[PDB]
Design a protein around this ligand. Structure first.
Ligand code: HEM
Length: 184
């Protein structure tokens, strides 16, 4: 179940966030912690492609090697708050599971600057959902969370000390696929 109406960043700069580049998840918090593994790798690209607002996602379980990519068109709910219906794709954008009603995530950018961000997502796959998930993002996959984004975590009435880091998993990413998937 999801329980949070995440508040988007005051003054959110959509063109800077959605600039076509890659964001790495460095730390995450699921409010239903058993919904996701305690060791995990994730990243995304975010941009406008031929006028359409898009995200490309990458997930990798470093223990099981379970890997998947997704491509989403985002619809606007309000500035910094989106609903994304996703299709599972291979790294080249070929469809493995088509867009389907009931398969969507909400996405709220609670904080962002040029290098760092805090997001919330509520994932739905049919009638289930994977609890509220918060993620600390960085442009540099090895960046420790700075004071700006940790302050944002506190401003959301969360504690950064409870977030789980992704940094000890030897995560390696295919940035080229994430960028090209934005067009798919
Ligand atoms: C747009 C930050 C994230 C977003 C937007 C996101 C989105 C998604 C989406 C769309 C799916 C379903 C993919 C599909 O079935 O085609 C998924 C599944 C999953 N995600 Fe994430 N995710 C994020 C981060 C994370 C993180 C950090 C972890 C634990 C850095 C995580 C763990 C999982 C797991 C384990 C599944 C599979 C769930 C199930 O099918 O049983 N995700 N995620």
């Amino acid at each position: 179940a999801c329980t949070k109406n995440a508040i988007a960043q005051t003054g959110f700069n959509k063109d800077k966030y959605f600039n076509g580049d890659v964001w790495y998840v460095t730390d995450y918090l699921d409010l239903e912690p058993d919904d996701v593994p305690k060791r995990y790798c994730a990243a995304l690209a975010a941009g406008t492609a031929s006028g359409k607002l898009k995200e490309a996602l990458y997930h990798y379980d470093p223990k099981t090697q379970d890997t998947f990519y997704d491509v989403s068109e985002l619809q606007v709910e309000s500035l910094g708050k989106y609903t994304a219906n996703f299709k599972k794709v291979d790294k080249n954008g070929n469809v493995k599971v088509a867009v389907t009603a009931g398969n969507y995530y909400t996405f709220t950018v609670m904080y962002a600057d040029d290098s760092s961000a805090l997001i919330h997502t509520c994932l739905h796959k049919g009638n289930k959902d994977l609890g509220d998930l918060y993620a600390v993002l960085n442009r540099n996959k090895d960046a420790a969370a700075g004071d700006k984004v940790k302050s944002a975590v506190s401003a959301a009435t969360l504690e950064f000390s409870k977030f789980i880091s992704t940094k000890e998993n030897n995560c390696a990413y295919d940035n080229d696929s994430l960028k090209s998937l934005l067009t798919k």
